[PDB]
Amino acid sequence: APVRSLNCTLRDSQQKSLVMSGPYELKALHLQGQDMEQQVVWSMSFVQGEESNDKIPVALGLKEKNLYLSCVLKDDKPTLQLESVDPKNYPKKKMEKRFVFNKIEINNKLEFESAQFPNWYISTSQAENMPVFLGGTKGGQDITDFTMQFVSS
């Protein structure tokens, strides 16, 4: 296939799951049992960009929905948002830079660095039910590492 993808779920290192808050927002919270089904299922796409043996560029969209994570400036600050795209033209090998994240593997966890804003990572709060965001400080009060779970597609 042109653009290759794989379906997965993601949890932060504190075992919190991701769920869609509103129409264009994501939140992270400790979910277990039946609630599990609420979590977001992603279609991770391997797109074009500067690739390394530990840094792979990817795009993240919801499975079956024309919604992708995007990094943009909002009120003079790098910001993470869910963005609507034409369902006919996506996904594609050459995604716009704002949709691109560098998937990084350190210990056994994953980190997603914004290709648009270097050293800015997708992060979650230690607190419960807070919005998922773009953070410029790694290894601090906020969480920036995740594990990935494959789904039967």
From Swiss-Prot:
Changing residue 128 to K: Increased affinity for integrin ITGAV:ITGB3. Suppression of integrin binding. Suppression of integrin binding. The record marks 55, 63, 65, 74, 88 as: Important for interaction with integrin. (Microbial infection) Cleavage by S.pyogenes cysteine protease SpeB promotes its activation independently of CASP1. SpeB-mediated maturation of IL1B plays a dual role depending on infection site: while IL1B inflammatory response prevents bacterial growth during invasive skin infections, it promotes streptococcal infection of the nasopharynx by disrupting colonization resistance mediated by the microbiota. The record marks 4 as: Involved in receptor binding. Changing residue 117 to C: No effect on binding to IL1R or on IL1B activity. Markedly reduced activity. Markedly reduced activity. It is found in: Cytoplasm, Cytosol; Secreted; Lysosome; Secreted, Extracellular exosome. The keyword Transferase does not apply. Induction: By LPS. Transcription and translation induced by M.tuberculosis and a number of different M.tuberculosis components in macrophages; EsxA is the most potent activator tested (at protein level). In pancreatic islets, release is increased by high glucose treatment. In pancreatic islets and macrophages, release is also increased by endocannabinoid anandamide/AEA. GO terms for biological process: apoptotic process; astrocyte activation; cell-cell signaling; cellular response to interleukin-17; cellular response to lipopolysaccharide; cellular response to mechanical stimulus; cellular response to xenobiotic stimulus; cytokine-mediated signaling pathway. Changing residue 74 to E: Suppression of integrin binding. Markedly reduced activity. Markedly reduced activity. GO terms for cellular component: cytosol; extracellular region; extracellular space; lysosome; secretory granule. Keywords: Cytokine, Cytoplasm, Inflammatory response, Lysosome, Mitogen, Pyrogen, Secreted. A motif (Involved in interaction with TMED10 C-terminus) lies at residues 112-125. The IL1B production occurs in 2 steps, each being controlled by different stimuli. First, inflammatory signals, such as LPS, stimulate the synthesis and promote the accumulation of cytosolic stores of pro-IL1B (priming). Then additional signals are required for inflammasome assembly, leading to CASP1 activation, pro-IL1B processing and eventually secretion of the active cytokine. IL1B processing and secretion are temporarily associated. Monomer. In its precursor form, weakly interacts with full-length MEFV; the mature cytokine does not interact at all. Interacts with integrins ITGAV:ITGBV and ITGA5:ITGB1; integrin-binding is required for IL1B signaling. Interacts with cargo receptor TMED10; the interaction is direct and is required for the secretion of IL1B mature form. Interacts with HSP90AB1; the interaction facilitates cargo translocation into the ERGIC. Interacts with HSP90B1; the interaction facilitates cargo translocation into the ERGIC. This is Interleukin-1 beta. It comes from Homo sapiens. The gene is IL1B.
